[model samples]
Target chain A: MTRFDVLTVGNAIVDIISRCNDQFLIDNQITKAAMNLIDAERAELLYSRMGPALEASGGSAGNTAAGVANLGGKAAYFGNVAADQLGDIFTHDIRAQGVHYQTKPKGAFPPTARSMIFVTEDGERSMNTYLGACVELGPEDVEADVVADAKVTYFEGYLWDPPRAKEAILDCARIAHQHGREMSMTLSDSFCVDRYRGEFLDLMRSGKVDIVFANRQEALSLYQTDDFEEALNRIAADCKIAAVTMSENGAVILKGRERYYVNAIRIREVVDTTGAGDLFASGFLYGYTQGRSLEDCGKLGCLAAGIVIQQIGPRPMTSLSEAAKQAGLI
Target chain B: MTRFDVLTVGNAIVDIISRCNDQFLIDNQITKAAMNLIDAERAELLYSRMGPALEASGGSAGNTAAGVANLGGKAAYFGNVAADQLGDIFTHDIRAQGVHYQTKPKGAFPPTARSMIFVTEDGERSMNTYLGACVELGPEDVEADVVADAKVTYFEGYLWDPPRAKEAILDCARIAHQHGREMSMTLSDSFCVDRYRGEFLDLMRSGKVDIVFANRQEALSLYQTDDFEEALNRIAADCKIAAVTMSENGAVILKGRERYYVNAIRIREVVDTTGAGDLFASGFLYGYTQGRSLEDCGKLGCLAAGIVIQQIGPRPMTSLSEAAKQAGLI
Candidate 1:
């Protein structure tokens, strides 16, 4: 109904990536692979002592929007910012990626959301974030018409951080379904799935969410199952489409009676693993809307994630159409 | 004295450059080789129609600071920003150049400056600048003690745009002189020289300005004379030392009764003229500070500029310094 094929909602963030040793984690009182929420003061102090940083636009749904745009479809996004330096960066980077950005930045309240990413020698990154202005996101921030206009409305599970963001997600999902549009949700991080497991499961079970995105770890965590096979079975029964990302082991896509174990593409190196799952949704959704087969969709998903994770930032779809064409996805 | 060899003062700008055909110039009503000031609305409108843009940090003084830093010397800089997206970029780039950045960004004023540069077929450029947060630079922003700490305090003539920037310049000059340090000023552009000839002459004649830098057109404009000989005589009488650049014709350096003429290095091709004059100063000042002969200073100056204007953006000086050493300056 609208120009956008997919509309995404999430916290718009600019990734400030720096290389550090494991000692940086221990000294900062952070354990390996843990997501820590810090205040502005601590974040600032720690940021100064970090290694060379490169700023790139990132966020789960934001990366997805870039994927759609790269796939020759229009995409729009809704997010919050606090009109600070980092906030401006987040906005510019997203809009620069060719996604329609309509969310208003908060006025005189808090700073924009920022994450301090510390990449260890082994390439595992520990993120310390301050939600900052993302807290301002609420149901009021969503426009009924905007969500209803998209073919699919997508929300990131991290929105559960602020109760109001959860309200926004539900309201938008209701509007999308009311307008005969499908809804999609990404489980985001393992911590987010653990925190909002009940609501996420409810969304999947209620038929409001037609598609779900999650990594193998997230799916395992979400379904409270240790076995990958059991987790896949539970998710397949719960949702219409389940795109489960398994990193280097490849992803498994469940579409009703069919389950495809998609092989991962060989990449040069894993520069950053931040946006691999988001780009998976992008490639799969792009294939889904374009009427591609499940196999092709999985391949495209793997191709997309492989390309993005090799770069520093999440949104690396600068030449996606050509890439898809090269990979024979089109 | 501080460990820095040279310190610079400037308005930090992030350049948004795009290549355009001849027709793009006609459609946009732009002329070649001129810098025009625009507002946010124009920046947004122009960029909307412009092709894909490439971003890099730039500013006359900032460029020189980077040059000095890249030449294996300590270089610190003072500039203004509004804590916005472009501000973050400008700050990181200049700081990454190994220059100390001391000025605090304005929390809630204009955003960081943006320069929309259009490179034509002939590798010439037309710029539309929005001086945004750079306007917040005031006399109070000058750290006099820090200015006196370095061996040389350098200023770009573009500081005249923000009138208060002159206060910072004067403050630095006073501190530099008081601490028995040298003060140098580069006439950033010919038009800049035309605009602030009076203030520039006063600074030079008062003995506060020791070394002067200017391309040929700027030098001629400074004396309001087209006659190169007349301009040379006048400048030689007023300033202790001066380097007058003549594009590929090399440069002429004047000091007392002695003058040195250095031929330009042969560059294979010039892709952009962005950092020509800036890097020239980088080499010249670097040589002068290192006790190289005036001839070596002019030759190294020409060598540095020749290498940079050959390709896009302000190139890293690791190669340029090596070339300078090969040319016997180091």
Candidate 2:
């Protein structure tokens, strides 16, 4: 048996989350519901300008790995962070979740990667990311034995922006294929899809990826179509297993010719939308590795994703195992 | 003219807050609803065994200073933190609330002081604090201008544990009185009162402290009396302005023989009781400095305390000014 159920590779980031008003976003000229990459100087300026924030461990795949561990699954993660205080926080938080994380901390001046997420009154987050030391990750950092030991290797699309991390992820994918382990990928964000649409499509078509996760905007962006049906059809035909999430409307999971629609779990208030997609992947992947039906996987994904949106941070404050059991997902 | 409304001197600490069950606390041999001082090794051991936590800036007087700033009052803070990332977080969070925090970070091995706060399902917190760099604070750390320029200099009794900080608070109180400013102090915790009851009474009787803040437990602990009325009378005779908080029963403000009772503002829930007394001091001192009536000050104090206890952290997330206005306390 494989040592791990899922292995995820991505940036190790700490989220500096603070509440702001709609006018604050407009004043700063920030695009609503988008992640903007800022340099270290801009990151300092923006953090000083914003109100106080709560620091929590984040990063798309990092959150997914944490969710998997929280759900009582064996998970491992690889990412780059600097050898600094913020890096220590990121490392401690992730490792404390029972996930195996063995990436060496690297670099200085730029420090650890951080996302300055502004959660508005409506619970929408306008993220400003400072990649910092996350750019140091490269193919040399990948451990073949570990990647091969996982049942599935998950890749985050945001890693593609950083050239070295992209190479690292590609190396992991090739190794996973060589070891007969399944491969998973998330489009990450709509803007990310716009940046690497060709490369991502090529990845899916080459049989390098066995499962794909995307949101409505990302799927639409990838297919270069405004029509939802056209985007869904394209995703359905392009992959063996395609899971697409729609905020509130629910998720659509397509397994070859079979299709299942799972409604989003009702949340009284959406405190923050920062980790919805990552958490969905966490639930679906956890269920998939357990050999559950695609419909059950979709339902579990919706449930986990729903639990995360109701709070301020991306990771679960409640035990995912007990929560999943209560929902009859396990 | 006074440059600030409130100047607070206390340890600058970060709260690592997590949720655990009652059984976990019992098994860990931790006392519920009390602060226990632990060494760095013990702090680390406790943290390692605990679940994921949310990092928030917390300290008794620090929360009070933040609360005063949140109420649109000019507030300044003096505390000890190491020159580290957690120190950066503590400094930024307090300053972001518009409170002036000018203490230079110090110490090496201890790093920043932090409280491992395990918040159970019932909203009670079992705090294990590592004094760390906070113990390095002394009379040298106190600025004459900073203490004297404030209308009131507030001290937290928890500082007494460090011995060095005890001297610092005394120096600050003397400086405040020299500049014709009132000195205020909180009993902090009941266990803290148990540790320094004789010294606390001496300080009150010596006329070094003009205002005193304490909850029912601390009051009882101070006088060694089980009768609440006897403890109230003892405090009333010992200090000129004694404010006694009775949890849901509200607060009693006694100035010499004149006494007034203010009802606690009914909150929908009590999320965390960590900073209730600290915030009460924030509102009370803010009103007192504004030349408000004693009863009005008591009402404002109750209002501020009510707002803080409804949240997980010690500091107020909502604007105390707006809350006081809505509650007709200002």
Docking class of 1: incorrect
Against the native chain B, each candidate's TM-score is 0.94, 0.98
Backbone clash numbers for all candidates listed: 1, 0
| Least well predicted 10-residue stretch by lDDT in candidate 2 chain A | A103-112
Q: Each prediction's Cα RMSD?
A: 5.3, 1.7
Model 1: per-residue Cα lDDT over A1-330, one tens digit each: 466688999987666766678887888786566567788898877766665355566767888988888778788898988766566556666676678887888684687777778877666778887778888998778977788788888889888886588888889888998888889999988887888899889989998789999988899999788898899889999999989988888888898879998899988888767677888888888887667888788888898888887755667634778888887777
Compose the digit string of candidate 2's lDDT tens values, residues A56-112: 899999999999999888999999999887887788889989999999865555589
Which ten-residue region of model 1 chain B has the weakest summed lDDT?
Answer: B311-320
lDDT of 2 by residue, B126-212 (tens): 899998899899988888888879999998889889968888888887888888999989998999999999999999999999999
For model 2 chain B, where is the 10-residue window of minimal lDDT? Answer: B101-110
**For residue B147, what is the lDDT in candidate 1?**
77
